[PDB]
UniProtKB/Swiss-Prot annotation, chain A:
Alphabetized PROSITE patterns for the sequence: CSA_PPIASE_1, CSA_PPIASE_2, RRM
Family: Belongs to the cyclophilin-type PPIase family. PPIase E subfamily.
Domain PPIase cyclophilin-type, first and last residues per copy: 76-223
Stretches assigned to the RRM domain: 2-70
Result for mutant: residue 124 to A: Expected to disrupt proline isomerase activity. Abolishes inhibition of KMT2A activity
Annotated InterPro entries: Cyclophilin-like_dom_sf, Cyclophilin-type_PPIase_CS, Cyclophilin-type_PPIase_dom, Nucleotide-bd_a/b_plait_sf, PPIE, PPIE_RRM, RBD_domain_sf, RRM_dom
Outcome, altering residue 5 to A: Decreased affinity for RNA
Keyword annotations from UniProtKB, A to Z: Isomerase, mRNA processing, mRNA splicing, Nucleus, Phosphoprotein, RNA-binding, Rotamase, Spliceosome
Tissue: Found in all the examined tissues including heart, brain, placenta, lung, liver, skeletal muscle, kidney and pancreas.
Protein name as catalogued: Peptidyl-prolyl cis-trans isomerase E
Means of activity regulation: Enzyme activity is inhibited by cyclosporin A.
The keyword Iron belongs to this UniProt entry's keyword annotation: no
From Swiss-Prot, chain B:
Quaternary structure and partners: Associates with RNA polymerase II, the TCR-specific proteins CKN1/CSA and ERCC6/CSB, and XPA. Identified in the spliceosome C complex. Component of the XAB2 complex, a multimeric protein complex composed of XAB2, PRPF19, AQR, ZNF830, ISY1, and PPIE. Identified in a pentameric intron-binding (IB) complex composed of AQR, XAB2, ISY1, ZNF830 and PPIE that is incorporated into the spliceosome as a preassembled complex. The IB complex does not contain PRPF19.
Ranges occupied by HAT repeats: 1-26, 27-59, 69-101, 103-137, 139-171, 177-209, 214-247
Protein name: Pre-mRNA-splicing factor SYF1
Subcellular location: Nucleus
Function: Involved in pre-mRNA splicing as component of the spliceosome. Involved in transcription-coupled repair (TCR), transcription and pre-mRNA splicing.
The encoding gene: XAB2
Residue window of the full protein shown: 22 to 285 of 855
Assigned protein family: Belongs to the crooked-neck family.
Source organism: Homo sapiens (Human)
From Swiss-Prot, chain C:
Quaternary organization: Identified in the spliceosome C complex. Component of the XAB2 complex, a multimeric protein complex composed of XAB2, PRPF19, AQR, ZNF830, ISY1, and PPIE. Identified in a pentameric intron-binding (IB) complex composed of AQR, XAB2, ISY1, ZNF830 and PPIE that is incorporated into the spliceosome as a preassembled complex. The IB complex does not contain PRPF19. Within the spliceosome, interacts with SNRPA1, SF3B1, SF3B3, SF3A1 and SF3A2.
Role, per record: Involved in pre-mRNA splicing as component of the spliceosome. Intron-binding spliceosomal protein required to link pre-mRNA splicing and snoRNP (small nucleolar ribonucleoprotein) biogenesis. Plays a key role in position-dependent assembly of intron-encoded box C/D small snoRNP, splicing being required for snoRNP assembly. May act by helping the folding of the snoRNA sequence. Binds to intron of pre-mRNAs in a sequence-independent manner, contacting the region between snoRNA and the branchpoint of introns (40 nucleotides upstream of the branchpoint) during the late stages of splicing.
Compartment list: Nucleus; Nucleus, Nucleoplasm
GO function terms (MF aspect): 3'-5' RNA helicase activity; ATP binding; ATP hydrolysis activity; mRNA binding; RNA binding; single-stranded RNA binding
Family statement: Belongs to the CWF11 family.
Major localization class: nucleus
Name this protein carries in UniProt: RNA helicase aquarius
Domain of life: Eukaryota
UniProtKB/Swiss-Prot annotation, chain D:
Gene source species: Homo sapiens (Human)
Annotated function: Component of the spliceosome C complex required for the selective processing of microRNAs during embryonic stem cell differentiation. Required for the biogenesis of all miRNAs from the pri-miR-17-92 primary transcript except miR-92a. Only required for the biogenesis of miR-290 and miR-96 from the pri-miR-290-295 and pri-miR-96-183 primary transcripts, respectively. Required during the transition of embryonic stem cells (ESCs) from the naive to primed state.
Subunit record text: Identified in the spliceosome C complex. Component of the XAB2 complex, a multimeric protein complex composed of XAB2, PRPF19, AQR, ZNF830, ISY1, and PPIE. Identified in a pentameric intron-binding (IB) complex composed of AQR, XAB2, ISY1, ZNF830 and PPIE that is incorporated into the spliceosome as a preassembled complex. The IB complex does not contain PRPF19. Interacts with CPSF3; this interaction is in an RNA independent manner. Interacts with the microprocessor complex subunits DGCR8 and DROSHA; this interaction is in an RNA dependent manner.
Subcellular location: Nucleus
Recorded superkingdom: Eukaryota
Family: Belongs to the ISY1 family.
Protein name as catalogued: Pre-mRNA-splicing factor ISY1 homolog
Residues of the full protein shown: 148 to 195 of 285
Gene name of the encoded protein: ISY1
Amino acid sequence: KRVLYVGGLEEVDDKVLHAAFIGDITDIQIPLDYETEKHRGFAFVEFELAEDAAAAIDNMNESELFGRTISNPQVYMDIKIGNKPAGRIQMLLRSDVVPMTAENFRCLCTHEKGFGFKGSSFHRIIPQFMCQGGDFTNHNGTGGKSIYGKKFDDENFILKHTGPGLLSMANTNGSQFFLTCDKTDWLDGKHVVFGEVTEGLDVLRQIEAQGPKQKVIIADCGE
Amino acid sequence: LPYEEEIMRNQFSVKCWLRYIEFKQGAPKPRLNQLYERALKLLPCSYKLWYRYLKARRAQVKHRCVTDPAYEDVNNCHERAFVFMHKMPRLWLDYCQFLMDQGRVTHTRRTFDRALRALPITQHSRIWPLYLRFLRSHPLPETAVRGYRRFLKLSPESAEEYIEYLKSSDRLDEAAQRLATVVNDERFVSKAGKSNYQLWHELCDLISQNPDKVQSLNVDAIIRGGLTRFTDQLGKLWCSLADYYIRSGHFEKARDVYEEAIRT
Amino acid sequence: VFLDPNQYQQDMTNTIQNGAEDVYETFNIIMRRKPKENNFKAVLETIRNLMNTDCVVPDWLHDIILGYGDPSSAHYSKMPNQIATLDFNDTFLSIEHLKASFPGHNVKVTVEDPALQIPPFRITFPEAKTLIVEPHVIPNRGPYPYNQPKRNTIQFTHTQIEAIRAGMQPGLTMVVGPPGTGKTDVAVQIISNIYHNFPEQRTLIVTHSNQALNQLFEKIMALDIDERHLLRLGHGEEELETEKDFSRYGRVNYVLARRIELLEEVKRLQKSLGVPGDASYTCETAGYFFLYQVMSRWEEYISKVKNKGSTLPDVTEVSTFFPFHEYFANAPQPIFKGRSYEEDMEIAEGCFRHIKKIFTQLEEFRASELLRSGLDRSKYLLVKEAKIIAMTCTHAALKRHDLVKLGFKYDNILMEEAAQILEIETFIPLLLQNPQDGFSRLKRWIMIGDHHQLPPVIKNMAFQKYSNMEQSLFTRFVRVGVPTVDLDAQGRARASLCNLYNWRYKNLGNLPHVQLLPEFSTANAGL
Amino acid sequence: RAELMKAIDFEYYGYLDEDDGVIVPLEQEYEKKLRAELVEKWKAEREA
């Protein structure tokens, strides 16, 4: 119970969040108005009963040592349909089934390879079949490049697109990744399913309802 | 110990200093305070080392009686901590607890006011009930009227403790104006489930038993306003109005208050 | 419009019972009047509020206002908490003037050297006529050349100095100044002595006519009183004063500009000392910057110099170990002349006292920083910050509701020209505050006036002739039998002019040091 | 609510309690008796 649930502080930064908590070891602020600060020690982790409602850039930030403000990597991409946000798809990319495609989706969300889903759009979206995007080269599913080159093989097809928010590596799998909102067992054996959005399944359903008639692009994304 | 002293000189973080003091945790108290002063001179604004310094200092200084140069050094390093940790309420609470340990009154009031200055608006709730305890620990009410006035200016839903303080420290007139100005407001929580009747009965009994102190308010207008406020429990307020006339010495007026107490 | 509520209630209880015509349903002419005479309703509201609040008048002024009992109990010689120690900066110009201006009193000077017998003086007041006087020195105000303004140069008479001696003590006192004696200098010396002895005390100064209030307010700039404690609310602010201002916003913005300048000086001292940090400091951070970087550096400075040591420290040791040499580069170099060790330590203590003056001024400005709104800042200026408050009677009766709305408190009350001030116009600024928790903050009540002078501007002859409503409170307090301080020597008019109207006053003499001037030695040309 | 609880705050920071001059000597007068009682209070527990 060393992590906090500090909210009420997008204008804040990690240094401004950790300056009040300094010996904080972890400080990961969410894309919404929430952050979690964790101290390594035991006496320094009791900041909720010690510096609650602390002033963070002329704003009070109440700190509670809980997990109310919120392994397989989670590609958390605020997928925006058009100029408005269609929801934050926190697609838990299944590293237990397809770890290479899950790491490719997580790196495309985090934009650590120079290109990826942070800013790309899904130009191959079908109604309750597939929504394929992540290609940052041609922006149509006909470009894209994986970590091994332009084209990479699928890792494993142990998972299946059996429900909403299930993510697969679209194609042979380069930078193309497909989110599924329904059953896609007919395409099994060709696209390796590498995700299941426990959070952002409503965002995947909104992306499937919008898909393309609208520019469904995740401008903000990360791990 | 020489390699540990060289490592503590070469390192800068709080964990090496805490490990060195835990290694040298005997009774080195003057050299320990010198090493504390050197470590905090190298590293300022570190909350863990400052809290450990004030905790070890307040634990070790206890042989001194009431007024010592060691206690003046404790006070001087308390504002030396408050240079950077003024926004931290725990060191303010530690200094105020040590000030009730020492017995200072006006300097404790000055440091409570400086804590109210330092904490902007948010952390006053961690320092205000200790100030209420400070004003309840002293039977003179001249500071405490203005202190509880400031507490009612900050949080207005605390007038019942002020009424209890003024009925325990015999400021009965100001208790009558405070009771009369809290019971006629619309939104007030007494935190006891009085349902606005026990407050009226307490105000009426307090202004009935002691009319010589209450020389500013209109007693009859307040109690008749309460009698027009209620419709079901009028008899106690009628007895309180005529008992106000009994302690005022007006037996015929008490008989008349009983007369329209019968009639209305 | 706010109609008359009592007359409205009388009209509603008249028009529904007796069947009369409704007054407020047939009006056809609206009438407006000029300002400064449309404030009689504020006067009556002040009177009604003073009637409604039961115990505004204190018990030591109750029998004096009502005139019952002994009329000399308002004098300062019958009171047990009489103030002994009094500080006089510029009242006495010389030690022989202090000796010659105290009749019936022996002066015991604590020193025997006449070189140190200089103003300022500190006099301890009661074999029974012994006055324990020590001539003390002013603290050093820093290395700045212009840190001392012009002081008083008027040599007052013994009666005029006894008037200040009665004015410093709490109670009722009066200065009966005939036209010629120059009571304005005595008034501003009373104001300066009150401000210098008790800077935490608040002085209300009330003058009816705005020209005489401006004439009394103009002389304060030529004294040793800082302008940040001055306040003058009202419509008669229009004087010849150069910096203008002097209002609720007009001194709060001066407080903010002074805070900005002193925080710039704190930033300059921070860059002189090499403390890390480039952002602007607040008043709290400035006070903690003082208590961490200036107080500790002064502590190690006096430890290395070792003032409380076995031997005398060196003169050049102060100059080498002073840590604020590069801060005072705007001062004329050198800061320390090196003549003597205690003189260099006096210069260093003057630098530290100017630094502490800046830091305690920022500690006073901390509360102005703590309030968000300018209305709260003007309230802070009106109640705590400004120590000198200059009113007229009409504006005081206008704003007496607003003063008790904003919680205005004072310590001493002065009315100038108490025969030009009416009796209700005397009583209204007496009671601008109310006693809280059984405590009265009123100590001094000083009437500077002349009961043989004019009644005020009354536009009806019959009221001022029959009803005697033109009789001032000064003239009434004379005619009951309170002992008065009648000024004797006159210091602006010719002696042959004074001999024409000296019979009206009790021994109106002539001051010789004004009459020996070349303007009074000669006569009128051509006559 | 910081903005609602900062609606009005006057005489809150201890700047008007010392202007009247009535509680400043009295707090020290009670402080002298309190510390004089605490001297013998700690002296009663020193040898015990």
